[PDB]
Amino acid sequence: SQFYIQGQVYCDTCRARFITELSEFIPGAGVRLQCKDGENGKITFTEVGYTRAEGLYSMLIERDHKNEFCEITLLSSSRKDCDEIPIEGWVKPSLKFMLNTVNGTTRTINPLGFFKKEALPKCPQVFNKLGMYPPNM
Amino acid sequence: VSQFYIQGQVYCDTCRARFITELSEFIPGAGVRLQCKDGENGKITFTEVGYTRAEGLYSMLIERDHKNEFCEITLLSSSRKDCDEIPIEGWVKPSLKFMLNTVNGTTRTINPLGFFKKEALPKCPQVFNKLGMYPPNM
Ligand code: NI
C-alpha cells in the first residue's frame, strides 16, 4: 500500500557530477524528501532520511500524501573531503519525481553526489574510457 | 570584439540511466538550444542553436561580451530515431544551467546531455553492478 523509495549518495570522486567506477559511497549522509500539492501549490509534508551501507537511503510514504510532486535534496555528508553540494548554475541539484507505483514495488531513484575538493588524478583516465571531453565549468 | 566558445557533448543514453556510461553512444548531428537571460527572471539576451559534429560534440559561439547571465542548454533534435526521446524528471525537461562570464579566445566544456533509447540493452544490468549501484527506475 505505501510507497517505498530507494536511493544512493556517492562522493563525486572526480567532480563529474555523475557516478563513475571511481566514485565512492557515503553512509550517514543527509537527505531531504519534500513534496508539494496542486490544489494549493503549497507544501504537504517533509521528511529527513539518512543513508546506511552503500549510501542507500530509504523512505516509506503513507498514501495520505498519494501522487504529489516530490523532489529530493542533499542535506549532510559524513565526510569532510566530500562536503560540497554541486550547484548547477544557480540552483541546488534537486531530483524531481512523482509519487506513483503499481504492485507496491519499490521505486529506486537516480543517485545524488557530493563534490570532492581535489579531483582524483586517475579521472582523466576515466573520462577517456567513456570517451568524453572532461567538463571544466 | 570577443569570441568565446562553450562546447558540450550529446550521447545516446543506451541504458536509460540519465547519465553517461561505458555503453553510451554519442549522437552526431544532434540539436542543442542555448538561451541566456538578464537574470533568473529577467529578459533573454539571446538564443542560439548548435548541432553536434563527431563524438556528439557541439561548439557554441559567443560573439559578444557577457557577464553573470543566466543561461541553460536544452535538447532539441536527434539524428537517430532509435534514440530520440528526451528524458523527463517527473515534470521538467532537463537542462544545463550555468552562469555566463565570458573570457576572450578560449573554450569551456560543460556536462553531456543524453537522449533515451527506447529499449535498454541486454547487459545494462551488468554496468550498474560494476558501479555498485541499484538499478534506477525513477
Ligand atoms: Ni503525512
Q: What are the b/e assignments for B4-29, b being 16+ CB within 10 Å?
A: bebbbbbbbbbbbbbbbbbbbbbbee
Report the alpha-carbon distance of residue B66 to residue B3 in Å, rounded: 11
Which among B19, B96, B138 has CB closest to A19?
B19
Q: What are the b/e assignments for A48-64, b being 16+ CB within 10 Å?
A: ebebeeebbbebebeee
Please name the method used to determine this structure.
Answer: X-ray
Pairwise CB contact (< 8 Å): B137 & A54: no
- From the centroid of its chain, how far is CA A49? 11
Report the alpha-carbon distance of residue B48 to residue B65 in Å, rounded: 15
Pairwise CB contact (< 8 Å): B137 & A6: no
Pairwise CB contact (< 8 Å): A130 & B55: no
Q: What share of chain A is helix, strand, coil (3-state, %, to 5)?
A: 10, 35, 50
CA angle B113, A137, B23 (to 5 degrees): 35
Q: Which three cell numbers stand for residue B118?
A: 527506447
Report the alpha-carbon distance of residue A122 to residue A126 in Å, rounded: 7
Resolution in A, one decimal?
2.8
Report the alpha-carbon distance of residue B29 to residue B32 in Å, rounded: 10
Half-sphere exposure of A32 (CA within 13 A, CB side): 12
Measured between beta carbons, the chain A residues lying within 8 angstroms of B102 are none
Chain B, residues 116-135, CB within 8 A of chain A, namely: 130-135
Cα-to-centroid distance, A87 and ligand 1 (Å): 30
- Please check whether residue B71 touches A, CB under 8 A: yes
DSSP, res B92: B
Q: Are A30 and A50 in contact (CB under 8 A)?
A: yes
Report the alpha-carbon distance of residue B71 to residue B69 in Å, rounded: 6
User: What's the structural domain count of chain B?
Assistant: 1
Residue-number span of the structural domain to which A86 is assigned? 1-137
Pairwise CB contact (< 8 Å): A25 & B132: yes
Pairwise CB contact (< 8 Å): A18 & B22: no
Q: Are B83 and B116 in contact (CB under 8 A)?
A: yes
H-helix or E-strand containing A128? Answer: helix A123-129
